[PDB]
Amino acid sequence: RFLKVKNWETDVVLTDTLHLKSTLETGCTEHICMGSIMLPTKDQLFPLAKEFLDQYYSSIKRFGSKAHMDRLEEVNKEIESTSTYQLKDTELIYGAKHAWRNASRCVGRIQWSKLQVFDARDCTTAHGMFNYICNHVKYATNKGNLRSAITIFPQRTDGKHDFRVWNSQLIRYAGYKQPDGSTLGDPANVQFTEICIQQGWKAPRGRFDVLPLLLQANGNDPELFQIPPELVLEVPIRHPKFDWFKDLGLKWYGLPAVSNMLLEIGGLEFSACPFSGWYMGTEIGVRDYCDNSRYNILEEVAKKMDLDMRKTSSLWKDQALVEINIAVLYSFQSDKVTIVDHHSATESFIKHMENEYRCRGGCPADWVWIVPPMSGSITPVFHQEMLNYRLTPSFEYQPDPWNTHVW
Amino acid sequence: RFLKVKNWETDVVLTDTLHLKSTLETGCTEHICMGSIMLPVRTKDQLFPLAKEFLDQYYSSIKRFGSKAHMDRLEEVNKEIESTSTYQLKDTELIYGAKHAWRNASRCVGRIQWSKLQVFDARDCTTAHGMFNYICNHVKYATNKGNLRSAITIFPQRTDGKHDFRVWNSQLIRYAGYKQPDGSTLGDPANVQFTEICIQQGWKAPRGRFDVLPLLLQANGNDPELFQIPPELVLEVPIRHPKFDWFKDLGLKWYGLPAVSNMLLEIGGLEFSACPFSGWYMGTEIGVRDYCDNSRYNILEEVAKKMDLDMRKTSSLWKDQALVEINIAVLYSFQSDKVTIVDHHSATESFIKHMENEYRCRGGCPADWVWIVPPMSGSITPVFHQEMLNYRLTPSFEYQPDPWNTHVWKG
Ligand code: HEM
Numbered sequence A: 001r002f003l004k005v006k007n008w009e010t011d012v013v014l015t016d017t018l019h020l021k022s023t024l025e026t027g028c029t030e031h032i033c034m035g036s037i038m039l040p041t042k043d044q045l046f047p048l049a050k051e052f053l054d055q056y057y058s059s060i061k062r063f064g065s066k067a068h069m070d071r072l073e074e075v076n077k078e079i080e081s082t083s084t085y086q087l088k089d090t091e092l093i094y095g096a097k098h099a100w101r102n103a104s105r106c107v108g109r110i111q112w113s114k115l116q117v118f119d120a121r122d123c124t125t126a127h128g129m130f131n132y133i134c135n136h137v138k139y140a141t142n143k144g145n146l147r148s149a150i151t152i153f154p155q156r157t158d159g160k161h162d163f164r165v166w167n168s169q170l171i172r173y174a175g176y177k178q179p180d181g182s183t184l185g186d187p188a189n190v191q192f193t194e195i196c197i198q199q200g201w202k203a204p205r206g207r208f209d210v211l212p213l214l215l216q217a218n219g220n221d222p223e224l225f226q227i228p229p230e231l232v233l234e235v236p237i238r239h240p241k242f243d244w245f246k247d248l249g250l251k252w253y254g255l256p257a258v259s260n261m262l263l264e265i266g267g268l269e270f271s272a273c274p275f276s277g278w279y280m281g282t283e284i285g286v287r288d289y290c291d292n293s294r295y296n297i298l299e300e301v302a303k304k305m306d307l308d309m310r311k312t313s314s315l316w317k318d319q320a321l322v323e324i325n326i327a328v329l330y331s332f333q334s335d336k337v338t339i340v341d342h343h344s345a346t347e348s349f350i351k352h353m354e355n356e357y358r359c360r361g362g363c364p365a366d367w368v369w370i371v372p373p374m375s376g377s378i379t380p381v382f383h384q385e386m387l388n389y390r391l392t393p394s395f396e397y398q399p400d401p402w403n404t405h406v407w
Numbered sequence B: 001r002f003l004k005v006k007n008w009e010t011d012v013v014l015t016d017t018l019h020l021k022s023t024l025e026t027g028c029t030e031h032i033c034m035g036s037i038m039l040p041v042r043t044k045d046q047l048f049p050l051a052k053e054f055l056d057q058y059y060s061s062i063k064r065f066g067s068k069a070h071m072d073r074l075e076e077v078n079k080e081i082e083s084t085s086t087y088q089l090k091d092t093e094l095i096y097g098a099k100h101a102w103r104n105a106s107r108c109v110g111r112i113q114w115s116k117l118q119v120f121d122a123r124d125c126t127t128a129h130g131m132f133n134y135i136c137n138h139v140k141y142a143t144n145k146g147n148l149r150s151a152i153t154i155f156p157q158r159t160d161g162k163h164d165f166r167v168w169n170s171q172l173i174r175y176a177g178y179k180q181p182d183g184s185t186l187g188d189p190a191n192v193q194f195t196e197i198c199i200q201q202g203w204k205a206p207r208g209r210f211d212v213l214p215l216l217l218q219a220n221g222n223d224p225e226l227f228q229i230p231p232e233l234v235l236e237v238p239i240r241h242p243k244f245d246w247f248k249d250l251g252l253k254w255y256g257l258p259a260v261s262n263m264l265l266e267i268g269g270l271e272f273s274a275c276p277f278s279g280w281y282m283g284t285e286i287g288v289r290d291y292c293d294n295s296r297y298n299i300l301e302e303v304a305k306k307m308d309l310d311m312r313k314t315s316s317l318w319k320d321q322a323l324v325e326i327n328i329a330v331l332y333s334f335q336s337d338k339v340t341i342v343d344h345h346s347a348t349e350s351f352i353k354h355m356e357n358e359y360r361c362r363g364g365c366p367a368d369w370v371w372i373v374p375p376m377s378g379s380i381t382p383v384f385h386q387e388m389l390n391y392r393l394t395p396s397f398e399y400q401p402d403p404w405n406t407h408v409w410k411g
C-alpha cells in the first residue's frame, strides 16, 4: 500500500504514496496487465466537485478555512439549483495545470506549472473559436520561441451542446488515398482530410498541406477555417552533413498542439481544450518520418547514404533512423524553433519525477510511453521503475466527433 | 471472456482466450499498473491440485485426456504425494514442462524456438562435482562449435527447501567485475558482488577486464564449491567493426553462449531451483546493454571519441550514433566467426509471426511489452506497435533470491 520504485542504474529508491489518491481505474487486474494497450447527473457531480475543491484549497494552504467551506457550500448550492457549476478563474488555471501534471504518458511535465491558460468559456460560435485559436497559435509560437498554452472552450452541458475541435492537432498535414494505390501526404489523416473535402475544403493535394480547422460550437455543425499561413511556423529539414538531405523535400511544423482531448476538472468536462508545447525531436524524426503507417522515408534515406540494404543485420534502418533524427534537431535549432532531444527530455523527467516524489509523494508515469521510441536504454527513463495510475484533474480521450455528431 | 489486441501498424486484431487459464498474479490492480516494475517447502494441500492441473494440461497436449493412462497417472501421483509428500515427473512430463515454461515466458522474444529445446535430465545428480560435469556437457553441447543449440539442464527438485541444488552464478559464463580502491571498476560491474564471493571462497582472480568466472555449485543444500569451466569449452568472439579498423583496438570481446542459471522452473507444483538454460544472443543484449549501459562496460564515450563525433551537446545524437556502430560491430563479429546470433529486426519480426501463430493455435501468447521491445530503435521494430497481454501461465520460470542471502552455511 506504500509502494517503492527503484532506478536500476542509480539504485535511487522512491516511495510512492500519491497512488492512494488514485480515483479512476487502469484496465489492469491481478490476472492480466494491460500496460501496452493504447486505449483501455446531479449525483456524481458534488463528490467530484468536493474532491477537487478540497485539493485546491489544500494547495493554497486554506484547507478547512471559511473561504473553503463557503465555496464548498456555494458550489453545492449551484449544483442542486443549476445541475452544474462554474469554476473560478483561479480554480480553472489550477485544474488545467494539474491535468498536465497528472498526464502519466507525458515526458515533458517538468514544465507543468508554466502553462498559459486562455479562458475561452465566454465563446459562443465557431468563428469565435477560430479567433481564440489563432491567438493561441500566435502566442504559443512566439516567433519560434515556444510557450506552453491551453485554450478552454465552454464546458459540456446536457451533452447535446458540445464544443469540439474536430482536428486531432491544430496544425497537421493532409492525407489523400490515390488510385495510384498509395497514400500522398500524411496517412494518419486520410479520414479527417476526406471529412474536410466533404465539408468543402479545396485540397491542394500536396505532400504537406496544412489542414483547415473544423470547429464545432455549442453542438452546432462544424465549420471550416484556414489558419492564417503567416501563423503556421514550419521548418524545412536539412542535415548538417548530407547536402542531398534537403532534396528529400521534408518539412515539419514547429507547434505541437493536441486538440481532440477532453479535460475533466472537478467533474466538469471541457470537450474542446486544445493545448500546446514544443516538440521532442523523436516525435517527428522517429514516428512522423519513419513509422510504416506515416511518412515512411527510411528506405529513401538509407539509399542516399548507400548503405547495404541487403541484410537487416547491417543495421541500415537504425543508421538511417539516427541521421533523420539528427536532421530534425539540426533544422529546428538552425531556425531557432524550440525543440528538445530525447536525451535532454528524459533527463529532465527524471529530475521532475524526483521533485514530485519528494514534494507530492509520487508521480504517475507510463513507462511504455515515457521511454523514447529510439535509443531506449541509453536514456535514464529506461532504467527507471514507474507506477502508473490515474489522478484527476486529467486529460482523457474522447470519441472522434464525426462518429458521434447528430448532423 | 474474450480480449482483443490491435497492431497499430497493420490493423491486425487478435483475440485472446488463453488468459482465462492463468492462475498466478501480476502485481497490477484496477488502481495501479506495475507493468514496469522489475521484480513484482510446499504442502500436500496445494500440491495435488497443481499436479492435477499440470497433468491435465500434459495429457490434453498428447490427445489422451481422460484416458486410462491419464487417470492412472493422477492416481499414481495422488498416492505418491500422500505417502511421500512430493512426487517425481516422468521424463516426458519433465520435457514437456520445461518446453512450456519457455513457451509461457512472457518477457522472452525468442519463443519462436520454444519447441526445439534439448532437455538434459540431471535429476540423478548428487554432488557439486556431479553438477560440474553436467554443466560442462551442457555447455559443450549447446556451443556446438558456434552453431548454438538451445538446451536446459535440470537438477533435482526442491524437497524441504533445506536441501536445494543451486547454481550461484547468475549465468554459466560471465566476466568478473572487480571494484578498485579508486572507485572505478575493472571488468563487468554487474558481477562485482558475485566475484567477491568467488574470491572469498578461494578463486585466484586473474584480475583482467574479461575473466571468465568460475562456477560456484551447491548440491543437496551443502556449501557451494568452486570449479573452472574448461577454457576450451568457452567460445568467445573478439569484437571488430567492418569499416572501423580502430574498433578491434578497444580490446572488446564477448562469449557466444548466453546461459541463465539462477532461475527456478516450476512444473506441476514442483520446484527445480537449479535449471540452467541457454540459447543464442540477440545482438542488442551485448551491444546495447552489456557494452553501453552506464552501469556495465560503458564504452559509449570511447567509441564516439574515436568516431570523432560532436560530443559537446547531446543533440548531435553522438550517443545514438556510437550505439549503432557498436551494435553493427557485435553482429558483424559473431557472423564472421560463425557463432549464431540474431539481430533485433529479425528477432522481433519472428516473434510477431510466433505470437500470431500462438493466438491461432493456442488462444493467446502472454507478452511483456516493456521487455519484448528492444533497447534500441524501438519504434522501427514491429513489436513496438503491437499491443500485448501480459499474464502468468504455468509451467513457468521464476526469480528466486540470491543463494548468498539465504544459504545456511555449514562450514
Ligand atoms: C512542453 C513540451 C512538451 C513535451 C516535450 C511533451 C512531450 C510529450 C511526449 C513525447 C508525449 C508522448 C506521446 C506521443 O509520443 O505522441 C506526450 C504525451 C502527452 N502530453 Fe506532453 N509534452 C509537452 C507539453 C505538454 C502540454 C503543455 C500538455 C498539456 C497541458 C501535455 C499533455 C500531454 C498528454 C495528455 C499526453 C498523452 C496523451 C495520452 O494520454 O495518450 N504535454 N507529451
Ligand code: HEM
Binding pocket: B098, B101, B102, B105, B107, B108, B109, B110, B111, B113, B117, B150, B151, B152, B277, B278, B279, B280, B281, B282, B285, B342, B347, B371, B397
Ligand atoms: C533462442 C535464443 C533466445 C533469445 C534470442 C532469447 C531472447 C531473450 C531476450 C532478449 C530476453 C530479454 C531478457 C533481457 O534482455 O535480459 C529473454 C528473456 C527470457 N528468455 Fe529468452 N531467448 C532465447 C532462448 C531462451 C531459452 C532457451 C529460454 C529457456 C528455455 C528462455 C527463457 C527466457 C526467460 C525466462 C526470459 C525472461 C527473464 C525474466 O522474466 O525476467 N529464452 N529472452
Ligand SMILES: Cc1cc(N)nc(COc2cccc(CNCCc3cccc(F)c3)c2)c1
Binding pocket: A038, A039, A256, A257, A258, A275, A276, A277, A278, A279, A280, A283
Ligand atoms: C502538447 C504536446 C507537446 C509535445 N511535444 N508532444 C505532444 C504529444 O502528445 C499527444 C497527446 C495526445 C495524442 C497524441 C498522438 N499520439 C497517439 C494518440 C492516439 C491514441 C489512440 C489512437 C490513436 F490512433 C492515437 C500525442 C503534445
Ligand SMILES: Cc1cc(N)nc(COc2cccc(CNCCc3cccc(F)c3)c2)c1
Binding pocket: A008, B038, B039, B110, B258, B259, B260, B263, B277, B278, B279, B280, B281, B282, B285
Ligand atoms: C536463454 C537466453 C537467451 C538469450 N538470448 N538471452 C537470455 C536473457 O534472458 C534472461 C533471463 C533471466 C535473467 C536475465 C538477466 N537479466 C534480467 C534479470 C534481472 C533482474 C533484476 C535486475 C537485473 F539487473 C536483471 C536474462 C536468455
Ligand SMILES: C[C@H](O)[C@H](O)[C@H]1CNc2nc(N)[nH]c(=O)c2N1
Binding pocket: A035, A036, A037, A038, A368, A369, A370, B008, B384, B385, B386, B387, B388
Ligand atoms: C502498442 C503500444 O502501446 C503503442 O505502440 C505505443 C507504445 N509507446 C508509445 N509511446 C509514445 N510516446 N507514443 C506512442 O504513440 C506510443 N505507442
Ligand SMILES: C[C@H](O)[C@H](O)[C@H]1CNc2nc(N)[nH]c(=O)c2N1
Binding pocket: A008, A382, A383, A384, A385, A386, B036, B037, B038, B370, B371, B372
Ligand atoms: C525499470 C525497467 O522495468 C527495467 O529497466 C527493464 C525495462 N526493460 C527491459 N527489457 C529487457 N529486455 N531487459 C531488461 O533488463 C529490461 N529492464
Ligand SMILES: [Zn+2]
Binding pocket: A028, A029, A032, A033, A034, A035, B028, B032, B033, B034, B035
Ligand atoms: Zn498493468
